[PDB]
From Swiss-Prot, chain A:
Belongs to the bacterial ribosomal protein bL35 family. PANTHER family: 54S RIBOSOMAL PROTEIN BL35M, LARGE RIBOSOMAL SUBUNIT PROTEIN BL35M. HAMAP family: Ribosomal_bL35. It comes from the Bacteria. It comes from Deinococcus radiodurans (strain ATCC 13939 / DSM 20539 / JCM 16871 / CCUG 27074 / LMG 4051 / NBRC 15346 / NCIMB 9279 / VKM B-1422 / R1). One of its GO terms (biological process) is translation. This is Large ribosomal subunit protein bL35. Part of the 50S ribosomal subunit. Contacts proteins L15 and L33. The gene is rpmI. InterPro entries: Ribosomal_bL35, Ribosomal_bL35-like, Ribosomal_bL35_CS, Ribosomal_bL35_sf.
From Swiss-Prot, chain B:
This is Large ribosomal subunit protein bL34. NCBIfam families: rpmH_bact. GO terms for cellular component: ribonucleoprotein complex; ribosome. One of its GO terms (biological process) is translation. Binds the 23S rRNA. One of its GO terms (molecular function) is structural constituent of ribosome. Keywords: Ribonucleoprotein, Ribosomal protein, RNA-binding, rRNA-binding. InterPro entries: Ribosomal_bL34 (IPR000271), Ribosomal_bL34_CS (IPR020939).
UniProtKB/Swiss-Prot annotation, chain C:
The keyword Ribosomal protein applies. GO terms for biological process: translation. Coiled coil: none annotated. It comes from Deinococcus radiodurans (strain ATCC 13939 / DSM 20539 / JCM 16871 / CCUG 27074 / LMG 4051 / NBRC 15346 / NCIMB 9279 / VKM B-1422 / R1). Part of the 50S ribosomal subunit. HAMAP family: Ribosomal_bL28. Signal peptide: none annotated. This is Large ribosomal subunit protein bL28.
Curated annotation (Swiss-Prot), chain D:
It comes from Deinococcus radiodurans (strain ATCC 13939 / DSM 20539 / JCM 16871 / CCUG 27074 / LMG 4051 / NBRC 15346 / NCIMB 9279 / VKM B-1422 / R1). One of two assembly initiator proteins, it binds directly to the 5'-end of the 23S rRNA, where it nucleates assembly of the 50S subunit. Coiled coil: none annotated. GO terms for cellular component: cytosolic large ribosomal subunit. It holds the Pfam family ribosomal_L24. One of its GO terms (molecular function) is rRNA binding. GO terms for biological process: translation. The gene is rplX. This is Large ribosomal subunit protein uL24. Belongs to the universal ribosomal protein uL24 family.
RNA sequence: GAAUUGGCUGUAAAGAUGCGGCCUACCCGUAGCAGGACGAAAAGACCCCGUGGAGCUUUACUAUAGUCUGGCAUUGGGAU
RNA sequence: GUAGGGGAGCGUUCAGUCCGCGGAGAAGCCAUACCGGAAGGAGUGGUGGAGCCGACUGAAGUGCGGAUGCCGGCAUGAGUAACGAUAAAAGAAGUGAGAAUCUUCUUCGCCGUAAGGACAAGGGUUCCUGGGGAAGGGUCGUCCGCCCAGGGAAAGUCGG
RNA sequence: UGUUAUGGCGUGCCUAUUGAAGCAUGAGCCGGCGACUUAGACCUGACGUGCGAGCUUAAGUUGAAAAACGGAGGCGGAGCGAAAGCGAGUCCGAAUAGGGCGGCAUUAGUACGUCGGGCUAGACUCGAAACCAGGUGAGCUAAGCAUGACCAGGUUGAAA
RNA sequence: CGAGCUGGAGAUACGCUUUGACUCGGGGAUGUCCGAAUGGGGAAACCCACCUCGUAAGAGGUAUCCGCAAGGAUGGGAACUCAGGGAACUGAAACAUCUCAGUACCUGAAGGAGAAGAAAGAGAAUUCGAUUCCGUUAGUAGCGGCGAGCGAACCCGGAUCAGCCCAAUCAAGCCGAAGUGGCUGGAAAGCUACACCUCAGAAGGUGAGAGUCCUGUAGGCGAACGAGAGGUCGUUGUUCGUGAAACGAUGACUGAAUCCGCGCGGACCACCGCGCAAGGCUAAAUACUCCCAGUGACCGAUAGCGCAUAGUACCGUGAGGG
């Protein structure tokens, strides 16, 4: 059986050139009028997971994409 | 005391009999299934 | 059973709460999904000599126009 | 798993033929084929010979009584002989007449 | 479990023939008793636990046989 | 030094190859004070009666004390409980390898709307004769509803 | 070596546990059966081997007491972005300041094998109570229908 | 074929066979009764009839459905095939859509295969050209309480190739090379001394291990008989869960054009491309394995099938277990 790709992880995770794993910062959908404008700015973004969380994601998409 | 099995020739024949078994698809299915198992006793009328 | 063509067969049938919303509500949830069956009707006409038989509705129209091999 | 199976139920010699005993205790003694059973591959030769016992039975006769009779042998300790050589000899199938098949050696024939 | 299987007092997972001290006791059995061997039997049935089960209940959720109901078909004509 | 990680090995079948044994006797089994750091390994002797050791390499249904584990054999309890209605037995005689139990005689005792007699349902040769005695009989049997053989069942009117 | 007398010393094994000789679990005994495996042309490491900026075939074809062909495909070769697209750059942005990346002060992969582990499958072995499908049962028992059978003897003494 | 035979059974007797037995191969004749059962009945294997011929003995006929007739059908078959019907446990660490899964099971029809098939197609090159099957694309594109999880196709490489008609050599068998002497031993194949055949050293049997003792192997021969439309509602199919939902598919209602016409290309329109529905058959590659043959780093008596044979004994009213 070919190991399947974890379709949830498709739109939320990114493989990197070196071989680290990325995602988008969170809290941006109704936690808005908070705000602060620098939070709202800092959140829409993107960023690298701390580390412990790497193996799993890697196993989520074997193809990298 | 009176026990479950109370022998009756006509009962047994009319109930587990070859004609009986042949009267229905499920009984036909027994017949075939048994034949297949290679039973000496296909059916009660074989006794 | 139908005149021309067998008929009867079916078809499950479903139904859905939170029915609609702004063309998109949140979405349509479906609480049902079971299993039903569909049918037709009956009347008496002929062929080769004297029969009676069942007739579809589409059959009664199709035959009221003209005989698609059997008669009235 | 019968004895003849290995030898295709076939006898390499006929009844009445003379035979030399190839193997065993009776090496080389010679005799007439008194009985030959193909399927079992067993053959009687007036040379083997044992002492059998008739036990109780009042037939033959109330008392016991012992007896001297030959005990059959396995085909593979038997051979056709060759009048010239006089010894253990193989066999070739050649022809005669008038539709008869016959048996030769390295110098026919028996 | 295997046994070459005493009593007191103590100690030990807190109820000891088997651990400590002290005491008692020659070896084997027969008929008898039921204090102990937490004696036997049933992986406690009370109780808790398991995002176990099943029967049952309802104005718990969901569907549904059945059933009431509008429209379409069988299904046509006329008169006001 | 527990869970756990790591390292080097022992033994088992099968397989390839090499060595090579074996009726002046293989594997297996049995005894043993010898050998190796351990799994383990040899020496000799007894058994057995036809196959097999060592070495390197390969592949596993590959190593047991547990699972109230599974199949099987044999222990303990023990010469213990029990021998299935408290209606009951005694003597003679016979038989027989052997008798409290079988056969005969004489009595005794127990049922007698039954523990007697006749059908049905069911059973299937259990009936009769002659023989038998391993097991079955809760003892014993010379006997039997057991084992062997041979016979036996007859319908126009009973039942279908 | 066997066997013994006497002295010293000594709380069965396993499991489960904070803690077992425990009066906590399992177990009569011995013999056998008895539990971490297989698969994919999956994923990811360690070891080894062959090629090496390259490496490799699958189905199949032919041959077959062997193997050879077969380049379709797959892996490296460039990243960055939501994507278009841009490209040793790219993305956010109007440019800056930044993230990812290339260079870097260097870095080799690929196919196979053995192994460690992951995934999916019964996935270490044994064990439920249950759930569903199709069938077998009213010779027991609960009742119905048709058709027959049976109730010593004694007492009491209603209407008319 | 050519001397034995008279089944496993090995047991006494009777006997058969070179006028060719026994066994092997190939056709016929006979073939009680039951079972689709089919004269009628019936508790399978038993009871009762009727008709034609016949001297009687006996023989033949007497079911239902399609057809004028001839002739066809019914029943059975482990798996494999298609079709009508269609679970739940379980996974989602609870559950309802979802998943298990169109799996299990039930029914049907049929064959040695079956299905499918001759583009109102796939598709994006104005490319390909019946279907099925393998590899691959590819866990990609997509699906999804966007959770668990489900999951194509095109291209490319293979296996096998096919498209036509209608409505106005194997199955019995035969021939078949070559060794002797001494020794150990109960027994020779082993030892030993010389010796031979090999298109034949595959294998089994022979008192222990045999190329050269037997059956065989390589090789050759071999038979009379034998064999080769659209729509709307309700739904669903493929990755297709109402999603923007195309397309096919029918249950209900309704219902157009026929060549300047018709159907598709993922709402929908134009344009540009591919296509000729409503009429049928089709071998080959593929599946399976009751049966047969060969093989095995498969098992050798708790193993291997449940059986060194038995679906028996035994258990159960029975299904069934064993
Ligand atoms: Mg003592
Ligand atoms: Mg205290
Ligand atoms: Mg003490
Ligand atoms: Mg002590
Ligand atoms: Mg007492
Ligand atoms: Mg408990
Ligand atoms: Mg309704
Ligand atoms: Mg240490
Ligand atoms: Mg070896
Ligand atoms: Mg061996
Ligand atoms: Mg044990
Ligand atoms: Mg117990
Ligand atoms: Mg036991
Ligand atoms: Mg006593
Ligand atoms: Mg006692
Ligand atoms: Mg006593
Ligand atoms: Mg007593
Ligand atoms: Mg008594
Ligand atoms: Mg008494
Ligand atoms: Mg006397
Ligand atoms: Mg008595
Ligand atoms: Mg007398
Ligand atoms: Mg009586
Ligand atoms: Mg009778
Ligand atoms: Mg006795
Ligand atoms: Mg006597
Ligand atoms: Mg008698
Ligand atoms: Mg009379
Ligand atoms: Mg505790
Ligand atoms: Mg602990
Ligand atoms: Mg204790
Ligand atoms: Mg204990
Ligand atoms: Mg406990
Ligand atoms: Mg116990
Ligand atoms: Mg490497
Ligand atoms: Mg690897
Ligand atoms: Mg595992
Ligand atoms: Mg012959
Ligand atoms: Mg009939
Ligand atoms: Mg369906
Ligand atoms: Mg459930
Ligand atoms: Mg769940
Ligand atoms: Mg059929
Ligand atoms: Mg629709
Ligand atoms: Mg659907
Ligand atoms: Mg459509
Ligand atoms: Mg054995």
């Amino acid at each position: 059986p070919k190991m399947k790709t974890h379709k949830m992880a498709k739109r939320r995770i990114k493989i990197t050139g070196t071989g680290k794993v990325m995602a988008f910062k969170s809290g941006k959908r109704h936690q808005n009028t908070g705000k602060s404008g620098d939070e709202i700015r800092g959140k829409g973004k993107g960023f690298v997971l701390a580390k412990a969380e790497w193996a799993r994601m890697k196993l989520m998409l074997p193809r990298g994409k | 005391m009176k026990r479950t099995y109370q022998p009756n020739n006509r009962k047994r024949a009319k109930t587990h009999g070859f004609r009986a078994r042949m009267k229905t698809k499920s009984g036909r299915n027994i017949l075939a299934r048994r034949r297949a198992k290679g039973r000496h006793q296909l059916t009660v009328s074989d006794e | 059973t139908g005149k021309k063509n067998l008929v009867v067969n079916s078809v499950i049938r479903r139904g859905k709460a939170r029915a609609d919303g702004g063309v998109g509500r949140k979405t349509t949830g479906i609480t049902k999904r079971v299993q039903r069956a569909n049918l037709h009707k009956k009347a008496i006409r002929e062929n080769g000599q004297v029969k009676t038989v069942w007739l579809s509705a589409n059959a009664i129209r199709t035959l009221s126009k003209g005989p698609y091999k059997g008669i009235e | 798993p019968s004895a003849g199976s290995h030898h295709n139920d076939k006898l390499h010699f006929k009844k009445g033929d003379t035979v030399i005993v190839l193997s065993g205790k009776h090496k080389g003694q010679t005799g007439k084929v008194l009985l030959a059973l193909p399927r079992d591959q067993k053959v009687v030769v007036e040379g083997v010979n044992v002492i059998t016992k008739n036990v109780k039975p009042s037939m033959t006769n109330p008392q016991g009584g012992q007896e001297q009779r030959e005990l059959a042998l396995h085909a593979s300790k038997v051979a056709l002989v060759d009048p010239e050589t006089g010894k253990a000899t193989r066999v070739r199938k050649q022809i005669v007449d008038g539709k008869k098949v016959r048996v030769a050696v390295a110098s026919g024939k028996t």
